[PDB]
Amino acid sequence: MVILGVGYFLLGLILLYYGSDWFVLGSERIARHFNVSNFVIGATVMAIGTSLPEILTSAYASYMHAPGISIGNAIGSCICNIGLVLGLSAIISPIIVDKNLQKNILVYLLFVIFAAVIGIDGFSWIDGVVLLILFIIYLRWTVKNGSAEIEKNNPSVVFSLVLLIIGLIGVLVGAELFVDGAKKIALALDISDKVIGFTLVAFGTSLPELMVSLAAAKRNLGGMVLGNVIGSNIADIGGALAVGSLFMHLPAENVQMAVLVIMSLLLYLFAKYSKIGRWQGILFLALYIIAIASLRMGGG
Numbered sequence: 001m002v003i004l005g006v007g008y009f010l011l012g013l014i015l016l017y018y019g020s021d022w023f024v025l026g027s028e029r030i031a032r033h034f035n036v037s038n039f040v041i042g043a044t045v046m047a048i049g050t051s052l053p054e055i056l057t058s059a060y061a062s063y064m065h066a067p068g069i070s071i072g073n074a075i076g077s078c079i080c081n082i083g084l085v086l087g088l089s090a091i092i093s094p095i096i097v098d099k100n101l102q103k104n105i106l107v108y109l110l111f112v113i114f115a116a117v118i119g120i121d122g123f124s125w126i127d128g129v130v131l132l133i134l135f136i137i138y139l140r141w142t143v144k145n146g147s148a149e150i151e152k153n154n155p156s157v158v159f160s161l162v163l164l165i166i167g168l169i170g171v172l173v174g175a176e177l178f179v180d181g182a183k184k185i186a187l188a189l190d191i192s193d194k195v196i197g198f199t200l201v202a203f204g205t206s207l208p209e210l211m212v213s214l215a216a217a218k219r220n221l222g223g224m225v226l227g228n229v230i231g232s233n234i235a236d237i238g239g240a241l242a243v244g245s246l247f248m249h250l251p252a253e254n255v256q257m258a259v260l261v262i263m264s265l266l267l268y269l270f271a272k273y274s275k276i277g278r279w280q281g282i283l284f285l286a287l288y289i290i291a292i293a294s295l296r297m298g299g300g
């Protein structure tokens with residue numbers, strides 16, 4: 001039963017590795033097909049695709065009367081996407097943000113500040129509906145401003161969509177196998193710890209973002225990286241958190257929200273007045289490390 005766990009674990013890593021690169025390549029081609037920037041494709045198709053685990057997890061957790069896990073997973077993913085995912089990626093491929101993308105990031109920041117303020121007393125189903133509506137508006141606004149609309153079944157298109165979809169299946173299945181594999185290893189060795197397992201929920205669901213962002217960074221696709229991070233956070237709030245709140249009132253996470261707000265503000269300030277490169281990435285990593293060293297365990 002331990003060899004099966006090791007099997008899943010290694011296999012999940014393989015799928016994650018190759019799948020992420022396929023997803024990126026297919027997404028980069030699709031962007032060129034539709035005449036939209038890499039940021040746009042990153043913030044929409046990629047962000048949502050990779051946030052499907054958060055959405056499902058938050059929904060499932062709140063339905064099972066564990067709303068703390070529901071919001072813990074959602075906001076923890078956001079902190080992970082900036083501190084760990086963007087941190088690593090910025091070091092690998094530093095980014096200077098153009099003026100139009102700076103505007104997108106400011107909208108993101110406002111969205112996050114708005115979510116923090118209405119969530120001070122926790123999140124109701126009404127808070128959820130509002131956030132989901134802003135999420136949809138964000139998506140349409142983003143696509144419009146990053147689109148140059150001008151124009152059977154071209155082999156370039158097909159191969160693009162195949163890469164993208166198979167890549168996405170690869171990263172999502174791979175993330176699942178990684179986690180399921182780890183869990184059966186821990187169970188087999190009798191080192192299973194539930195509160196540890198619930199602490200790592202936002203991470204396991206963030207493995208697609210991590211591997212996808214790293215693959216894009218290796219190909220110097222900085223805008224795509226930034227799109228994936230910014231979009232995943234909005235999807236995690238207007239999607240994962242929001243849907244959670246539909247089943248049950250979510251408890252406040254004011255400390256984690258303050259952390260997210262601070263990291264999000266830092267991200268905008270770097271984008272606007274500087275760059276997102278080596279030392280910005282180092283700072284994001286240091287803050288992430290401080291966060292996981294100090295924040296209360298249990299995943300909510």
Ligand SMILES: CCCCCCCCCCCCCCC
Nearest residue numbers: 270273274275279280282283286
């Ligand atoms: C943004 C212009 C200044 C760049 C240098 C200051 C921002 C990066 C600071 C990194 C500090 C890293 C500390 C690690 C412990």
Ligand SMILES: CCCCCCCCCCCCCCC
Nearest residue numbers: 091278281282285286287289290
């Ligand atoms: C090309 C590699 C450049 C340096 C990468 C440094 C990463 C530092 C991450 C944080 C270390 C711990 C800080 C603890 C407060």
Ligand SMILES: CCCCCCCCCCCCCCC
Nearest residue numbers: 259262263287288290291294295
């Ligand atoms: C370099 C400016 C940092 C401003 C915020 C400083 C305190 C740390 C905030 C982020 C990480 C989580 C801290 C609480 C665990």
Ligand SMILES: [Ca+2]
Nearest residue numbers: 033154156157
């Ligand atoms: Ca074409």
Ligand SMILES: [Ca+2]
Nearest residue numbers: 118119122123
């Ligand atoms: Ca509220």
Ligand code: NA
Nearest residue numbers: 047050051232
């Ligand atoms: Na995502």
Ligand code: NA
Nearest residue numbers: 050051205206
């Ligand atoms: Na995710």
Ligand code: NA
Nearest residue numbers: 077202205206
């Ligand atoms: Na996550």
